[PDB]
Structures are given as C-alpha cells and as structure tokens.
Amino acid sequence: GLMQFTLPVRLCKEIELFHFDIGPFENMWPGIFVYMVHRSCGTSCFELEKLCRFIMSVKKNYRRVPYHNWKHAVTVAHCMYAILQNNHTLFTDLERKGLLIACLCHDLDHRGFSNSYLQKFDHPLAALYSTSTMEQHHFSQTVSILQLEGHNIFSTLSSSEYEQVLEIIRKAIIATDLALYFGNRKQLEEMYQTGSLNLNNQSHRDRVIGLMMTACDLCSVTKLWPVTKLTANDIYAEFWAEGDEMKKLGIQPIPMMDRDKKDEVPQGQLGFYNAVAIPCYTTLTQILPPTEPLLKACRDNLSQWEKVIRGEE
Numbered sequence: 001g002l003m004q005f006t007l008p009v010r011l012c013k014e015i016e017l018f019h020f021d022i023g024p025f026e027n028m029w030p031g032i033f034v035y036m037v038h039r040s041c042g043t044s045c046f047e048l049e050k051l052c053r054f055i056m057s058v059k060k061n062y063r064r065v066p067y068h069n070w071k072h073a074v075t076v077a078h079c080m081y082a083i084l085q086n087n088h089t090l091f092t093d094l095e096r097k098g099l100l101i102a103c104l105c106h107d108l109d110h111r112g113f114s115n116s117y118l119q120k121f122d123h124p125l126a127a128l129y130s131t132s133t134m135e136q137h138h139f140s141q142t143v144s145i146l147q148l149e150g151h152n153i154f155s156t157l158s159s160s161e162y163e164q165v166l167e168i169i170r171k172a173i174i175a176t177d178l179a180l181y182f183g184n185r186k187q188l189e190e191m192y193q194t195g196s197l198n199l200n201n202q203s204h205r206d207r208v209i210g211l212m213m214t215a216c217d218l219c220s221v222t223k224l225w226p227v228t229k230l231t232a233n234d235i236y237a238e239f240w241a242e243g244d245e246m247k248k249l250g251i252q253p254i255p256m257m258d259r260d261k262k263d264e265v266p267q268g269q270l271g272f273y274n275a276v277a278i279p280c281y282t283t284l285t286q287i288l289p290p291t292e293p294l295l296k297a298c299r300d301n302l303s304q305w306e307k308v309i310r311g312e313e
C-alpha cells in the first residue's frame with residue numbers, strides 16, 4: 001500500500017509535459033507506466049502484484065516491429081496520462097483506470113501491417129473481423145490477457161463496473177482505427193459549433209474519448225522535432241515493408257508505402273498533418289482547452305516539414 005514509484009528528477013518533471021519522450025531504456029518503461037497509473041488513478045486502483053504481471057504479459061504480446069511495438073504502447077499511454085492530468089475533474093474513476101490500460105493495449109500483437117494489407121492478403125483475421133480488423137484483434141488480445149490467472153487487475157470492481165470498464169476499453173481501442181477518426185471528428189466539430197456537445201450524454205463522451213485515443217495514437221507528431229523526425233523513420237520502415245508485401249501480391253502500393261518514392265515523403269507528411277493531425281488536435285483543443293500544447297507542438301512540426309521541402313533541412 002505504501003510503495004510509491006519515484007522517477008529521477010528530470011523524468012519526474014518532464015513526464016508531466018505532453019512532449020515527454022520515454023527514453024531508450026526499455027527496463028524503465030513498466031515503472032514509468034505504474035508511476036502514471038498511481039498519479040492518474042491512485043495507488044489503490046490496482047493490486048501492484050497483478051498490475052506488474054499484466055504489464056509484463058502485455059509487453060510479451062507486442063512484437064519486435066519498427067514502430068507498432070511496446071515503446072509505442074507506453075508512448076500512447078503517456079500522452080493519455082498528460083491529457084487526463086491536465087483535465088483532472090472531467091473524467092470518472094473508471095475512465096482514468098480504463099483509458100491508460102486501453103492505450104497500453106491498443107496495438108497488442110500488431111504485425112506492422114494495415115487493415116488494407118490483411119484484407120488483400122486474405123488473412124484469417126480479415127474473415128473474423130470485416131472492419132477495424134487489427135483493432136478487434138487488439139481488444140480480443142486484451143481480454144485474453146485479463147483472463148490469465150493472476151492478471152485480472154479489475155477483480156475488485158462490481159460486475160457492472162467491470163462491464164463498464166471493458167466497454168470503455170473496447171470503444172477506446174476500436175477508435176484507434178484511423179478510418180473511423182474522420183467521421184468522429186466531423187460529428188464532434190458539428191456538435192461543438194452548433195453548441196449541442198454535452199459531456200453528460202454517454203454517446204458524446206464516447207466520441208470525445210475516441211478523439212483523445214486518435215490524439216494519443218498520433219502523438220509522435222507532437223514531440224520535439226528531433227523525436228518526431230526519428231520516429232517518422234520507424235513509421236516509414238513499416239510502410240515500406242507493407243509496400244514490398246503489396247508488390248509480392250502483384251499490387252502497386254500507394255506512393256506513401258513505396259520505398260522507391262522516398263522523395264515524396266515530406267509532401268506526404270504535409271498532407272497527413274493538414275488532413276489528419278492538425279484537424280485532430282484543433283477539435284481536441286476546442287473540446288479540452290488544456291490540450292493546446294499538442295496543437296502548438298503539431299503546428300511546430302508541420303513548419304519543420306515545410307522547411308525539409310524548401311531544402312532548408
């Protein structure tokens with residue numbers, strides 16, 4: 001009960017900032033996550049023995065792929081931690097519990113390929129789950145790990161609270177399907193502008209948690225430029241491997257995924273910032289004003305990519 005996690009002074013301070021980088025020491029990531037759960041939720045939310053076993057089973061079920069890996073999981077959970085900490089009173093006890101776990105689990109057993117590649121491959125998962133293929137798999141994997149003996153971190157909840165938290169986690173993980181983000185953001189835009197957005201409306205909360213999940217999932221674009229730039233290498237390492245696998249199926253991949261067309265990357269980043277990232281953090285900042293640093297950091301990185309195109313780097 002009286003066993004607090006403490007981080008070194010630089011991490012203790014920097015971890016509260018949206019643009020915090022979790023660092024290259026894998027062995028510190030579990031402790032960073034537990035630290036964030038204790039401050040975000042309470043030292044009582046989870047049985048420490050159970051939580052540690054859950055975290056290590058989650059780590060084991062992330063693969064050694066360039067980007068959709070254990071580091072991404074903890075990076076996305078940290079962004080959620082920063083949003084929750086800057087929006088203290090807006091979220092329930094169950095929501096703070098659910099969302100950090102949802103974020104840690106959101107890409108469980110990712111193979112580094114898009115839903116599109118699975119469907120064109122005719123992967124078994126594409127037969128089992130026609131839409132949000134990988135996201136339905138990630139949630140499936142989460143429930144599987146929760147059901148391991150000694151791994152049920154929610155055991156102290158009532159039947160009804162247990163069903164509420166697994167329903168929060170399911171929707172949160174489904175929302176990380178970027179295909180669903182466009183419609184979700186549009187509806188949130190309409191609702192915020194016409195003034196109908198109502199955080200006591202469960203369907204409205206769901207939408208807002210969805211947008212937070214997109215924002216945390218894309219938070220690579222909200223880091224300082226050196227982190228953003230080096231993470232984009234890992235992202236494109238996966239895209240190019242998928243492009244190679246598309247070519248093996250006798251399909252010319254979109255230029256984004258074609259390693260012959262690396263020149264077109266900087267312009268592809270502009271499109272992504274303008275079509276996805278900027279609108280995402282804009283709508284998020286409208287609904288949750290204290291998340292503005294994510295929009296500001298994102299705009300700064302767009303400017304850095306414009307400088308790459310103008311050959312100034």
Ligand SMILES: c1nc(N2CCCC2)c2cc[nH]c2n1
Nearest residue numbers: 178218220221235268269272
């Ligand atoms: C281009 N496209 C991207 N998305 C496409 C699918 C999901 C991530 C990203 C994400 C981070 N940086 C990116 N650059």
Ligand SMILES: [Mg+2]
Nearest residue numbers: 106107134176
């Ligand atoms: Mg995903």
Ligand SMILES: [Zn+2]
Nearest residue numbers: 072106107217
């Ligand atoms: Zn992800």
